[PDB]
Design a protein around this ligand. Structure first.
Ligand code: CLA
Ligand code: CLA
Ligand code: CLA
Ligand code: CLA
Ligand code: CLA
Ligand code: CLA
Ligand code: CLA
Ligand code: XAT
Ligand code: XAT
Ligand code: XAT
Ligand code: BCR
Ligand code: SF4
Lengths: 735, 85, 30, 164, 201, 80, 91
């Protein structure tokens, strides 16, 4: 009953099971630990970062090793459009003979790989199960490096100080230039040297790379300035990927669009992209000042940025010390940027597939988009939660105020009511009218008169599609016109490739849109606005409100303030995160439902099914869920089973976890404490069991813990059931 | 130091210890010349003549970079003029 | 197909990475 | 000014006096980040010793070989692959056995480079000035060897001629 | 970089004078015990108790390897594979083309024998109050003192004799595995070569 | 044990003391209000955190404030 | 399909219904606000909200046809917006 929460003496003195539960959930909140200083905080965070990167590299190495050992990578190379990639083998003693037979792939039961790693590794120039093994070996070596570094930087003479940790200019210069630019430069080097010849049949391994010229002229044009030579003779339109037939000699080109065979971006396009990004980031990494008297001091930049007329208060004067001294502000900024970035990855890796033969891998396309959108929602909610935490525990009004006037951040708490009221107005506006149009379509179609539907053509979005060259909406605007200056400017660089790809019905590049797209985009906007409303309200109201003008004195996460003053359930800022998680899950569900139904109709060919039935709710319920759930639920029946049996089991498992979350959310404490007391009496008053007694007094889960557990069940069930549905439906419908 | 300002124009220290000492009568015309040169270089590399692999012309490219710069030069020119410089 | 030697040495190297992990874990304290 | 190697720069604060071989050569100011010069000196001396041994092995393998056939490769970089993995793993295990105790030793001691290796007692009876002179000799020779062994590796990777 | 100190003066390493002399074995033992208590106090790790137990197991296993070689040579060690219909799909190793290669029956029998011995060990582990030599160290008990480079030359059924023989057997197993890995033959093939041919005859 | 603080906005109306179910609060002499009394929290080890004390507080934003903290068998209301 | 980009050619699909709704909803909001502000200066403002003063309610409701003009005659006089008597939370 002691010594487990070593970091908290208050918990270690708890005589109940709450100590164990809270010991887990407070282990990473280093700022709240006993005998805590800032130096130890930054050093522990640094070591934890090292361990985390080691974990990531070990996970990647495991994926590589299991593809190399139990996969069919080599067979998939020779026939990427017919051979289904294998993730890893299965050894489960609970299998019957039927399950073994159904999951049997080649030599052993195995799982199909939906991560798209086969296409990614094939694109970057891997052709052998020994190339994957080398990658796994190297990644385990890197993990060992990172673990050694993490141990080393906790040693006495190697523990960095607060000044080093808060040295913003040095870290920015190095991160930008070194990390981004130099990693892009090295990736361009690999892309060219290995990937470009490997796509043309020439093997460039760790033996013949110092003697195989990536370009026939060989670094002469680069120093000579004749950089056009690297773009001459690109890959033809009859080039077979991985073979020298119809190949070229160029290494950096503009082509635009996709490879005619793999239906993916040109490797020479991506090498040029990464070279340009490398140059730009290396240049941008010299901005801030270091030991050589030139550069920028960001404190001065922030302080000097006050509009002269005066509408942002005193400007950004106090922001430097605010961000530097707070790890939650930086964490929130990083999480918001990462969420936007992974939303970008999801939205671009389906419209512009970058890996060979990934466009025809429909289950992996759906899985990748869903995975990245869910990660995006999680990251955004985390960014807002950490902003709220910064408000609660790191924000100092004195730093952000100069002689009564407030800086740009402190002024966000002055018109907080205006911000929240207008977020509420936008949410109500969008919800009222999107639901009104959807229900109008529902009722009108149900009454057998679909012509009375309200169908709004998304002209604004179709205008953008025409601006990028789509000649489908008869707009003749910028790139849909051959005479506009936008078209004449790039008529010789990348329009022929771009136009040939955007004006193609088999791509996902700028999918044609209609009224259903309009309505679902408005639903998405409503979801985004409502999630933002909840999170922003929790962040701004974190330090106090009218119901609790001292909420900052109770911390970020507390159960309530009691039944007084009318009742104060879910009044903390943590509860705002807890409520906004449901809205994030709902919004990501809407986004992924829209994407998956649109792409299922596109792949099956019945795009008229979406364009007609997507305007009313029953259309969704009947033609997406009810229609495509048939293959999934018949993964096992009283007659047999298929390789989709695991997905049906996961479907039911997700439903069960969802409803257990419903348990933990609807039923609150107090009802579970008295029942536990009855159980305690029963155990204490029964023979043959009195010999065994608990060391920690069994008590009901706390209010905040119960909310967390219900949210965890809700989210896990949500994710599992939707993953099972999307994967099984795609597999069982599209062969 | 103290780049923070509340008057009509920021102090000349915000321009760095290279632009803080340029007379406004030098920065102004220099900014206008740089803007004109950059606009002409952009309109000669593109717009008037369509771009091609064989026609990149580092002068026009480097030139075009004077347009973004021009913005900074005339901002500094105004700052110097308002600070009696 | 990878050999027994390839898998065995990868397992041995994985063990070394495990001993480095507990050293980091124990250094981050109980 | 205070740098002897770069007579024009002033050396950094941590480059002074003791720690023989101190010629004020730290233009990039790397010593400003390390808490002390103990670990960096240990690493420099380990590199110096390994590079001396590497240069000696390069030349000897160029001219002298073991009686067996597996050691008949003249090119050291080609011998890196021709030699059986058993010999190389034995060498690596020996080095790691030497390295783990010194791993415990280096991160905490005042003289991490002092491994107590003096079987012939070349330092017993030597005065402080003579000991410092010996340390300077070792550091010089090691730096020259490091440059030389890197040059040999580069010229073998670029021309295939392992020597001259 | 220059206007500040990367490492604070208050956080600096101090040389541990408590390990002066203290040959690498003593230093390693002390470092392990200080760094990992509650597993060192149990006798686990680089400890004399663990060394003695592992030596006993290595000697018994040299006996077991000899017995296995004899059984393989003398027509024992049942033939074929396990019945998947009888023992489920967990005994299936691979399916090449329409035939299920299962775990060899000989491997199953050897695993059952090893299970017998391991069960005996587990009983002795959870029988601490009735066994002569316990598996772990009692709280308070102190680990027998390391024997050193060469244990005392005391012939017979002595602690030093068992210690020396356990070290020899463990080194023999290490050498056997090293020879098998380096040369590439089976473990039993290496034992057969190292016995002239008198085992697999 | 939870933390209970009393603030000088106390008007000495005694409603907090007579609402405490575990005898944590008591009325002590004072000279900052008409009643000449102020609430005190000398037995916070018995505080259970039910916050009945501040449900009976008539002052604007409370004069008795309960800050939940470390848990104890007394503060958890455990009869077992 | 409805063309709601703003062009007057398809103006009867969205724009004219938009104007009609804006008029009606502004009428409703104006009469509600006027009733709230009118019974807010009586002895029992809360009583007149559950028990509507039907005479005054009818008087105000039929006066909402000038809500666009009334709104841009009360905003000019500063009677439409409160300034600093509005309450704010602690931060
Ligand atoms: C060149 C030198 C260099 C390099 C390579 C690094 C590299 C790193 N440092 Mg680091 N650091 C440096 C110098 C350097 N540092 C210096 C000088 C200091 C002292 C001032 C620090 C102080 C420091 C601290 C205190 C910490 C790090 C950490 C890290 C790691 C970050 C985690 C990671 O793996 O990210 C990998 C990231 C990438 C490979 C790139 C990310 C790609 C992004 C997401 C895509 C963005 C593209 C685009 C913009 C998207 C938007 C679209 C656009 C249209 C807008 C990383 C390994 C952290 C860590 O984990 O420590 C172990 C940490 O806590 N460093
Ligand atoms: C007035 C002096 C002067 C001038 C005008 C040049 C001009 C040039 N040098 Mg050069 N050079 C000079 C002095 C000069 N050098 C001196 C003093 C040295 C050292 C002694 C060199 C060493 C040198 C090398 C080693 C190389 C050049 C090259 C080049 C050409 C490549 C430029 C290019 O496309 O950028 C290329 C742009 C980038 C690399 C990045 C931007 C260019 C004509 C290159 C060449 O091949 O010329 C034909 C080359 O490889 N120079
Ligand atoms: C790199 C990103 C990052 C980082 C560094 C942190 C770091 C931190 N967060 Mg944070 N957070 C993040 C992302 C991040 N978070 C995101 C994305 C969200 C939104 C979901 C949040 C939401 C959040 C909240 C709401 C809170 C924190 C808190 C904290 C602090 C303490 C964490 C703690 O106690 O962990 C405790 C760890 C756990 C309780 C483990 C939970 C594990 C979950 C339930 C998943 C495990 C189930 C698993 C999937 C099983 C699968 C089931 C199977 C059947 C399939 C710490 C500073 C807390 C704090 O006090 O901050 C000051 C706090 O209240 N964060
Ligand atoms: C289908 C279920 C459902 C529906 C319809 C809503 C509807 C709403 N929620 Mg919501 N919510 C739900 C489930 C749901 N929620 C769940 C399960 C949670 C997790 C606890 C939340 C958590 C939550 C939070 C935390 C917040 C909302 C908010 C809102 C409002 C957003 C504005 C809007 O759309 O106005 C339009 C309203 C509708 C379309 C629905 C009512 C209209 C009916 C049909 C009129 C019929 C008249 C006869 C709206 C009233 C936000 C809010 O109050 O914004 C102002 C807010 O802050 N909800
Ligand atoms: C220590 C000083 C030194 C000396 C005397 C030489 C001497 C020589 N080098 Mg050399 N070299 C050195 C350092 C040195 N190098 C270093 C530090 C590098 C970079 C790591 C190189 C890289 C290098 C290359 C790449 C080549 C030489 C070549 C040569 C030969 C002409 C000549 C024998 C050339 C030669 O003839 O190779 C056999 C040749 O191609 N060297
Ligand atoms: C799984 C492999 C395995 C095998 C083959 C053995 C084999 C053996 N163990 Mg053993 N043991 C094992 C695992 C194993 N152990 C584990 C994992 C533990 C820790 C719980 C132990 C703990 C243990 C103890 C405590 C004892 C043994 C004993 C024995 C011996 C009993 C044979 C006998 O009666 O000879 C005739 C034999 C050497 C006993 C012994 O020393 O020999 C009699 C004994 O006292 N073992
Ligand atoms: C009739 C008077 C009236 C007026 C002028 C307003 C005006 C406003 N409300 Mg509002 N509101 C009202 C009644 C009114 N409301 C009522 C009765 C409710 C309870 C359901 C709300 C609930 C409400 C919420 C939840 C929100 C607003 C918001 C707003 C603002 C933006 C407009 C909006 O979103 O409409 C919202 C309108 C509704 C949700 C529907 C109102 C219900 C009916 C139609 C109004 C009642 C008519 C009344 C009985 C007429 C009697 C008068 C007669 C006796 C003479 C704006 C200041 C939003 C805001 O703060 O943005 C700045 C916001 O988030 N209001
Ligand atoms: C090996 C060496 C010193 C070895 C000393 C040892 C082991 C001493 C060990 C001991 O003292 C201790 C530690 C402790 C004592 O109690 C015991 C002993 C055992 C006695 C120095 C080498 C020092 C080696 C040096 C300085 C080498 C310099 C090399 C140069 C300049 C080469 C240049 C070229 O190779 C290139 C670059 C390119 C080629 O093509 C052309 C040429 C010209 C050939
Ligand atoms: C070689 C070895 C350890 C070598 C350790 C070394 C060099 C350590 C060196 C260092 O510490 C120093 C000096 C100083 C430190 O600062 C640094 C390092 C470098 C760390 C252990 C072998 C250890 C070998 C062991 C433990 C062998 C155990 C064998 C057993 C138990 C037998 C099992 C069987 O009987 C069964 C169970 C069933 C039968 O069928 C099969 C068999 C296998 C026969
Ligand atoms: C001790 C041993 C076996 C002991 C067995 C015992 C006690 C059995 C006891 C029994 O009660 C049981 C358990 C069960 C009963 O039913 C049977 C009996 C019999 C009653 C095997 C050692 C086996 C020991 C072996 C195989 C040793 C191999 C050593 C090698 C190869 C050494 C090589 C080197 O020496 C060189 C060549 C050069 C050096 O410089 C380097 C190195 C590498 C050190
Ligand atoms: C709470 C809080 C927080 C947080 C916050 C957040 C989380 C936010 C988010 C945010 C976000 C998330 C934002 C976003 C943004 C975005 C943007 C801003 C965008 C932009 C874009 C653009 C501008 C584009 C443009 C264009 C176009 C459109 C076309 C193409 C081309 C171009 C480029 C021109 C913090 C921590 C900080 C602090 C405290 C408070
Ligand atoms: S919680 Fe409020 S009421 Fe319950 S005891 Fe402590 S003070 Fe008295």
């Amino acid at each position: 009953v002691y010594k487990f929460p070593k970091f908290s003496k208050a918990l270690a003195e708890d005589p109940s099971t709450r100590r164990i539960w809270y010991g887990i959930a407070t282990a990473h909140d280093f700022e709240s630990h006993d005998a805590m200083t800032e130096s130890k905080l930054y050093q522990k965070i640094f070591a934890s970062h090292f361990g985390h990167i080691a974990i990531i590299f070990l996970w990647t190495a495991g994926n590589l090793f299991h593809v190399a050992w139990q996969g069919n990578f080599e067979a998939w190379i020779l026939n990427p459009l017919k051979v289904r990639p294998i993730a890893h083998a299965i050894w489960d003693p609970h299998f019957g003979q039927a399950a073994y037979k159904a999951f049997l792939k080649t030599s052993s039961p195995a799982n199909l790989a939906l991560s798209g790693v086969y296409e990614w590794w094939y694109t970057i120039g891997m052709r052998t199960n020994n190339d994957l093994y080398q990658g796994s070996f190297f990644l385990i070596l890197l993990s060992s490096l990172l673990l050694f570094a993490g141990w080393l930087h906790l040693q006495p003479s190697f523990r960095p100080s607060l000044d080093w940790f808060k040295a913003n200019e040095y870290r920015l210069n190095h991160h930008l230039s070194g990390l981004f630019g130099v990693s892009s430069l090295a990736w361009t080097g690999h892309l060219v040297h290995v990937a470009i010849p490997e796509s043309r049949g020439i093997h460039v391994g760790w033996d013949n790379f110092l003697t195989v010229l990536p370009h026939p002229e060989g670094l002469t044009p680069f120093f000579s300035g004749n950089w056009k030579a690297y773009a001459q003779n690109p890959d033809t339109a009859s080039h077979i990927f991985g073979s020298g037939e119809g190949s070229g000699t160029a290494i950096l080109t503009f082509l635009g669009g996709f490879h005619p065979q793999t239906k993916s971006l040109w490797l020479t396009d991506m090498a040029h992209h990464h070279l340009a990004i490398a140059v730009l980031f290396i240049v941008a990494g010299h901005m801030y000042r270091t030991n050589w008297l030139i550069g920028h001091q960001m404190k001065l930049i922030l302080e000097a940025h006050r509009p002269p007329g005066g509408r942002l208060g005193i400007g950004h004067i106090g922001l430097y010390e605010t961000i530097t001294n707070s790890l939650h502000f930086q964490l929130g900024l990083a999480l918001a940027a990462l969420g936007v970035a992974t939303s970008l990855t999801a939205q671009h890796m389906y419209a512009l597939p970058p890996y060979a033969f990934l466009a025809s891998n429909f289950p992996t396309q759906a899985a990748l988009y869903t995975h990245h959108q869910y990660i995006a929602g999680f990251l955004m909610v985390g960014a807002f939660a950490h902003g709220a935490i910064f408000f609660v525990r790191d924000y100092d009004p004195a730093v952000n105020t100069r002689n009564g006037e407030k800086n740009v951040l402190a002024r966000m708490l002055e018109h907080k009511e205006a911000i929240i009221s207008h977020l509420s107005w936008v949410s109500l506006f969008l919800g009222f009218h999107t639901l009104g149009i959807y229900v109008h379509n529902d009722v009108v179609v149900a009454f057998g008169q679909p012509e009375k539907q309200i169908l709004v053509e998304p002209l604004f979005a179709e205008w953008i599609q025409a601006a990028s060259g789509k000649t489908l909406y008869n707009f003749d605007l910028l790139l849909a016109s051959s005479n506009s200056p936008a078209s004449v400017a790039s008529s010789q660089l990348w329009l022929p490739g771009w136009l040939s790809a955007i004006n193609d019905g088999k791509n996902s590049l700028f999918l044609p849109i209609g009224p259903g797209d309009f309505l679902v985009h408005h639903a998405i906007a409503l979801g985004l606005h409502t999630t933002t409303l909840i999170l922003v309200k929790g962040a701004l109201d974190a330090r106090g409100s009218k119901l609790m003008p001292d909420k900052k004195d109770f911390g970020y996460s507390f159960p309530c303030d009691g039944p007084g003053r009318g009742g104060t359930c879910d009044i903390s800022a943590w509860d705002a995160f807890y409520l906004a998680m449901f809205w994030m899950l709902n919004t990501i569900g809407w986004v992924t439902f829209y994407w998956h139904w649109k792409h299922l109709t596109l792949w099956q060919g019945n795009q008229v099914q979406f364009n007609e039935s997507s305007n009313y709710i029953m259309g969704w319920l009947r033609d997406y869920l009810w229609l495509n759930s048939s293959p999934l639920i018949n993964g096992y029946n009283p007659f047999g089973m298929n390789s989709l049996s695991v997905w049906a089991w996961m479907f039911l498992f997700g439903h069960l976890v969802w409803a257990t979350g419903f348990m933990f959310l609807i039923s609150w404490r107090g009802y579970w404490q008295e029942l536990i007391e009855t159980i305690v009496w029963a155990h204490e008053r029964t023979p043959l069991a009195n010999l065994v007694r608990w060391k920690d007094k069994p008590v009901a889960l706390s209010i905040v813990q119960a909310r967390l557990v219900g949210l965890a069940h809700f989210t896990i069930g949500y994710v599992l059931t939707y993953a099972a549905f999307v994967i099984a439906s795609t597999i069982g419908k599209l062969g | 130091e103290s780049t923070y300002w509340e008057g009509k124009a920021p102090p000349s220290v915000v321009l760095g210890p290279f632009l803080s000492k340029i007379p406004s009568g030098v920065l102004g015309p220099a900014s206008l010349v740089a803007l004109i040169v950059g606009s002409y270089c952009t309109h000669e590399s593109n717009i008037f003549n369509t771009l091609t692999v064989d026609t990149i012309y580092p002068a026009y490219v480097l030139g075009s970079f004077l347009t973004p710069i021009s913005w900074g030069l005339h901002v500094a020119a105004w700052i110097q003029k308002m600070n009696k410089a | 197909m990878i050999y027994d030697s390839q898998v065995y040495i990868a397992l041995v190297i994985a063990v070394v990475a495990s001993v480095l992990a507990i050293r980091l874990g124990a250094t981050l304290y109980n | 000014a205070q740098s002897k190697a770069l007579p024009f720069l002033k050396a950094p604060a941590k480059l002074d006096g003791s720690l023989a071989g101190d010629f004020g050569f730290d233009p990039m100011g790397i010593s400003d980040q390390v808490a002390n010069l103990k670990y960096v000196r240990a690493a420099e001396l380990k590199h110096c010793r390994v590079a001396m041994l590497g240069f000696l092995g390069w030349v000897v393998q160029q001219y002298v070989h073991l009686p067996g056939e597996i050691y008949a490769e003249s090119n050291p970089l080609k011998a890196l692959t021709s030699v059986p993995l058993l010999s190389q793993i034995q060498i690596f295990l020996f080095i790691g056995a030497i390295e783990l105790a010194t791993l415990d030793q280096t991160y905490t001691a005042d003289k991490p480079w002092d491994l107590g290796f003096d079987p012939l007692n070349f330092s017993k009876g030597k005065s402080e000035q003579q000991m410092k002179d010996l340390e300077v000799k070792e550091l010089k020779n090691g730096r020259v060897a490091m440059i030389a062994i890197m040059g040999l590796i580069a010229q073998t990777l670029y021309t295939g001629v392992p020597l001259f | 970089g220059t206007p500040f100190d990367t490492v604070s003066k208050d956080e600096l390493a101090v040389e541990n004078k408590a390990m002066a002399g203290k040959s690498v074995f003593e230093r390693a033992m002390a470092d392990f015990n200080g760094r990992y208590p509650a597993v060192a106090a149990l006798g686990l790790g680089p400890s004399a108790k663990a060394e003695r137990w592992n030596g006993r197991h290595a000697m018994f296993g040299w006996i077991v390897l000899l017995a296995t070689g004899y059984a393989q040579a003398h027509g024992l060690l049942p033939e074929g594979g396990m019945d998947a219909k009888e023992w489920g799909t967990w005994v299936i190793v691979s399916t090449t083309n329409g035939e299920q290669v299962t775990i060899p029956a000989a491997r199953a029998a050897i695993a059952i024998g090893h299970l017998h011995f391991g069960a005996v060990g587990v009983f002795a582990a959870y029988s601490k109050n009735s066994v002569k030599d316990r598996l772990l160290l009692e709280p308070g008990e102190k680990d027998e003192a390391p024997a050193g480079l060469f244990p005392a030359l005391r012939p017979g059924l002595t602690k030093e004799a068992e210690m020396l023989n356990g070290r020899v057997a463990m080194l023999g197993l290490v050498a056997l595995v090293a020879v098998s890995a380096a040369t590439g033959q089976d473990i039993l093939s290496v034992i057969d070569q190292g016995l002239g041919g008198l085992l697999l005859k | 044990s939870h933390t209970v603080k009393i603030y000088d906005t106390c008007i000495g109306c005694t409603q907090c003391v007579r609402a405490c179910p575990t005898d944590v609060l008591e009325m002590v002499p004072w000279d900052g209000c008409k009643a000449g009394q102020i609430a005190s929290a000398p037995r916070t080890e018995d505080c259970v955190g039910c916050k009945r004390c501040e449900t009976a507080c008539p002052t604007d934003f409370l004069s008795v404030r309960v800050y939940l903290g470390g848990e104890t068998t007394r503060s958890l209301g455990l009869a077992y | 399909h409805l063309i709601t980009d703003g062009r007057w050619s398809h103006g009867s699909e969205f724009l004219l219904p938009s104007i009609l709704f804006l008029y009606i909803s502004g009428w409703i909001g104006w009469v509600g606000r006027k009733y709230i502000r009118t019974v807010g200066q009586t002895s029992n403002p809360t009583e007149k909200e559950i028990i509507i003063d039907v005479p005054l309610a009818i008087s105000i409701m039929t006066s909402g046809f000038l809500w666009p003009f009334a709104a841009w005659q009360e905003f000019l006089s500063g009677d439409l917006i409160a300034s600093d008597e509005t309450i704010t939370t602690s931060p």
